Structure formats: C-alpha cells, structure tokens
Design an enzyme around this catalytic site. Structure first.
Site, mmCIF file in Angstrom:
data_model
loop_
_atom_site.group_PDB
_atom_site.id
_atom_site.type_symbol
_atom_site.label_atom_id
_atom_site.label_comp_id
_atom_site.label_asym_id
_atom_site.label_seq_id
_atom_site.Cartn_x
_atom_site.Cartn_y
_atom_site.Cartn_z
ATOM 1 N N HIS A 6 36.400 45.068 44.323
ATOM 2 C CA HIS A 6 36.424 45.844 43.128
ATOM 3 C C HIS A 6 35.551 45.818 42.094
ATOM 4 O O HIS A 6 35.371 46.240 41.150
ATOM 5 C CB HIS A 6 37.961 45.608 42.265
ATOM 6 C CG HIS A 6 38.293 44.490 41.795
ATOM 7 N ND1 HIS A 6 38.595 43.345 42.493
ATOM 8 C CD2 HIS A 6 37.799 43.964 40.846
ATOM 9 C CE1 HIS A 6 38.960 42.379 41.633
ATOM 10 N NE2 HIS A 6 38.052 42.671 40.419
ATOM 11 N N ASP A 10 40.297 43.471 49.387
ATOM 12 C CA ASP A 10 39.563 43.230 48.218
ATOM 13 C C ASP A 10 38.359 42.281 48.642
ATOM 14 O O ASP A 10 38.479 41.179 48.042
ATOM 15 C CB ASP A 10 40.419 42.888 47.144
ATOM 16 C CG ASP A 10 39.608 43.053 45.562
ATOM 17 O OD1 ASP A 10 40.053 42.723 44.743
ATOM 18 O OD2 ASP A 10 38.459 43.744 45.714
ATOM 19 N N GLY A 16 36.565 38.385 34.135
ATOM 20 C CA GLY A 16 35.247 37.793 34.144
ATOM 21 C C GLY A 16 34.887 36.880 35.582
ATOM 22 O O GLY A 16 33.654 36.507 35.722
ATOM 23 N N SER A 28 36.669 37.630 38.438
ATOM 24 C CA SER A 28 36.733 38.312 39.925
ATOM 25 C C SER A 28 35.662 38.151 40.585
ATOM 26 O O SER A 28 34.364 38.089 40.346
ATOM 27 C CB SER A 28 36.614 39.862 39.387
ATOM 28 O OG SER A 28 38.280 40.320 39.155
ATOM 29 N N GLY A 29 35.808 38.204 41.962
ATOM 30 C CA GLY A 29 34.688 38.054 42.969
ATOM 31 C C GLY A 29 34.561 36.520 43.323
ATOM 32 O O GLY A 29 33.669 36.299 44.388
#
Ligand SMILES: [Ca+2]
Lengths: 35, 223
Positions: free
Chosen positions: B40, B84, B175, B177-178
């Site tokens: 995402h 994801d 902030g 994410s990932g």
C-alpha cells in the site's frame, strides 16, 4: 458502531474499511502536508 | 510509533524512509540494492532515504537513492490488504557501512510471545498528531493468532499477524507503514494497518514476511 460493516472511507490519504465489529481500520501511511 | 522511545542514531541501520517529496512510509534494507516495504506504500518515482535519524536535518549519514523498480506482490489486494508486501530495487547499490546495513530474512515464522523491535517516523499520539524528528522504536511481542483474529473479526489472513499490547498504549501508527518488525534478528513483519493506534483490543497488524521468503528471492533473481 462508528461505522456500518463493509463501508469504506479515507482518513486523509489512508484507506479505511469498516469491520463487522462496526469499527474502522486504516492503513498507516504518511500523507502530503495540508494547505 | 505511539508509546515508543528514541532508537538512537543509526541503531536500526536497515530502516529506510520512502520519500515522494515528503516522508510517507518506512521500509527495510534486505541487501545492498533491495528494500522490503508494504504494497500500500507503492508510488511511482519513490526516493529511498537510507542512513536517516533526524528525517528533517541532513546529518551526514544519509544516502538518497531512487527506486528503479517498485514491485507490489501480484496478489496484493487493496480491498483486504492481503499480501501487503512490495520490493523496491534501488537504481544503484547502497554503500554498506555501520550506519547503513541490511537485515536478514527469516528462516522460520515467528512465534507468539517473541519480543520484536518496531520502528518508524510515524505519529506518536493516539489522539491527535505529533510527528517525531528522530527515529522511534518500540519493543512489542507477537500476539497469538487467536487474539489477533478476535480483535479483527474476519479480516486476519494467514499472511498477517498482530503484535503489541491488548491493553493499548503502545503501537505503530500513521507514518510507520512499510517499516520493520524485527524478531530474533530477522525481518518478520511489515507495518500494515490497524484500528486507530494504540487502542485497547486493537493491536497493530503486520504483513507476515516469513510467507514470502521464496517470493522475494525469486523476484530479486528475475529482476
Ligand atoms: Ca537526516
């Protein structure tokens, strides 16, 4: 419920989905600065 | 990261920032030319920023390298957030040093009750917003599958796990994410989603990296 199950929305630039519990869940990205 | 602590400069040397003119996601360096992040977090034209501590000051540990390839898992589904995961190939290899270093992929999936390190530059508040200048860290355990499923009915796939605290107060947040979840010295998770941040009975949900080790190796090999 804060939402109806299956609905979607955005909070800023993150996408959110309403679970069957009637609670939103959203992705966790950062977003462009506001105007 | 809500309820976390200052990591200390370059103590998480595999943590990267994905930049689209501003910081928007984390990621993890897995070799000198490849980063793992969340699907995402895909955008075209990403700049990867390595060696960062203060994300708003040039301090001298940094390498900025454009992505040459940003590869979302083909079975990523934005409707469910299943699969994801994204691989980013750097246009040129990062120079590896004490401050910029890769993190190993898992050899087995993580167990409930293992402590992990979660990190990022995301929001530090559960109500309202406060973004830190320096990288924040959180020690958080893997939660049982059954408690994860109970918290998020019908939404947790075999490619997701929960980590954190059912009592609330400590979590990843917008902030983050990932970014990485590291357990036993291995990259086990990717910050993905949750209901709010740090809420009771709503732990963070993370992509389960151990399910993708073969996919990662095959995608690197062919690209
Ligand atoms: Ca910096």
């Amino acid at each position: 419920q804060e939402c109806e199950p299956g609905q979607t929305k955005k909070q800023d630039c993150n996408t959110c989905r309403c679970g069957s519990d009637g609670v939103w869940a959203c992705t966790r990205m950062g977003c462009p600065p506001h105007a | 990261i809500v309820g976390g602590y200052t990591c200390g400069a370059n103590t998480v040397p595999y943590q990267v920032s994905l930049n689209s003119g501003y910081h928007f996601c984390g990621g993890s360096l897995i070799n000198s030319q490849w980063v793992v992040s969340a699907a995402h977090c895909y955008k075209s034209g990403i700049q990867v920023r390595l060696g960062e501590d203060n994300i708003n000051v040039v301090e001298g540990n940094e390498q900025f390298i454009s992505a040459s390839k940003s590869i979302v898992h083909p079975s990523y589904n934005s409707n469910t957030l299943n699969n994801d995961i994204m691989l980013i190939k750097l246009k040129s290899a990062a120079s590896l040093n004490s401050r910029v270093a890769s993190i190993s992929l898992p050899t087995s999936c993580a167990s409930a009750g293992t402590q992990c390190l979660i990190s990022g530059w995301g929001n530090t508040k559960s109500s309202g917003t406060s973004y830190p200048d320096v990288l924040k860290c959180l020690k958080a355990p893997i939660l049982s599958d059954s408690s994860c499923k109970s918290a998020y009915p019908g939404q947790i796939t075999s490619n997701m796990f929960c980590a954190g605290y059912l009592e609330g107060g400590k979590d990843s947040c917008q902030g983050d994410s990932g970014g990485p979840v590291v357990c036993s010295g291995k990259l086990q998770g990717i910050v993905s989603w949750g209901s709010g941040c740090a809420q009771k009975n709503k732990p963070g949900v993370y992509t389960k990296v151990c399910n993708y080790v073969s996919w990662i190796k095959q995608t690197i090999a062919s690209n």
